[PDB]
RNA sequence: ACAU
DNA sequence: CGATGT
């Protein structure tokens, strides 16, 4: 089982969990940063991993790219497959922004199609995903 | 247990 | 050491 180098890798970064959430997508081969989301003041790790995949799908579709996406998040891969982010984060005024983005990402999934394979990055075999923030 |  | 998730 080998890395598919012609791919997009995504990952969340956070300050606290729940805490400040950001995410980015990179070229798996070169590490070039292709997109980065502006920090969101409160969210969870899994909400951010979910948003990163959905943004990757939107990014690749806009560019007519058939590359797969790698994520290290078992949870977020499932949530994208299900088109449903099963987060436990409370809804209040401080979490309104992240929940709006997650709701809108689900809505996009329910109104668009894609063939993009969403693949598990095998951290145990390959080390940290290329989009990692280097914070652990 | 597994993945973050 | 704590949290988010299956
Ligand atoms: K990891
Ligand atoms: K990190
Ligand atoms: K646990
Ligand atoms: Mg990750
Ligand atoms: Mg990471």
Summary of the model, kept short:
With 136 residues, this protein is α/β, with parallel strands linked by helices. It has four helices and six strands; from the N terminus they run E-E-E-E-H-E-H-H-E-H. Strands 1, 2, 3, 4, 5 and 6 form a six-stranded mixed beta sheet that branches.
What's the total number of strands?
6
Element string (H = helix, E = strand): EEEEHEHHEH
Pairing-aware structural class of the strands and helices? alpha/beta
| C-alpha geometry | globular
- Give helix % range: 25-40%
Backbone CA Rg? 14 Å
* Attached small molecules: potassium ion, magnesium ion
Question: What is the CATH superfamily classification?
Answer: Ribonuclease H-like superfamily/Ribonuclease H
| Main β-sheet description | 6 strands, mixed
Number of domains: 1
Number of helices: 4
Q: Measure the end-to-end span.
A: 26 Å
CATH architecture: 2-Layer Sandwich
CATH class: Alpha Beta
% residues in beta strands: 15-25%
CATH-defined topology: Nucleotidyltransferase, domain 5
Task: Indicate the topology.
Layout: E1 8-16, E2 19-27, E3 33-36, E4 40-43, H1 45-62, E5 69-71, H2 74-82, H3 96-109, E6 118-120, H4 123-126
Parallel strand pairs: 1-5, 5-6
Antiparallel strand pairs: 1-2, 2-3, 2-4
Helix pairs in contact: 1-2, 1-3
The structure holds potassium ion (3 copies) and magnesium ion (2 copies).
The protein binds a DNA/RNA duplex (4 and 6 nucleotides) through helix 1 and helix 2.
PDB class: hydrolase/dna/rna
Keywords: protein-RNA-DNA complex, double helix, RNA hydrolysis, in crystallo catalysis, metal dependent catalysis, monovalent cations, divalent cations, hydrolase, hydrolase-dna-rna complex
Entry title: Crystal Structure of Bacillus Halodurans Ribonuclease H1 in Complex with an RNA/DNA Hybrid: Reaction in 2 mM Mg2+ and 200 mM K+ for 480 s at 21 C
């Amino acid at each position: 089982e080998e890395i598919i180098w012609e791919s997009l890798s995504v990952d969340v970064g956070s300050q606290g969990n729940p805490g400040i959430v950001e995410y980015k997508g990179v070229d798996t081969k070169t590490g070039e940063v292709l997109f980065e989301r502006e920090p969101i003041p409160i969210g969870t790790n899994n909400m951010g991993e979910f948003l990163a995949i959905v943004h990757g799908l939107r990014y690749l579709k806009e560019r007519n790219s058939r590359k797969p996406i790698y994520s290290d998040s078992q949870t977020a891969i499932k949530w994208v497959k299900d088109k449903k982010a099963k987060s436990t984060l409370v809804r209040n005024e401080e979490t309104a922004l992240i929940w709006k983005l997650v709701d809108e990402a689900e809505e996009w999934l329910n109104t668009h199609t894609y063939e993009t394979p969403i693949l598990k990055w095998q951290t145990d075999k390959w080390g940290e995903i290329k989009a990692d923030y280097g914070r652990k």
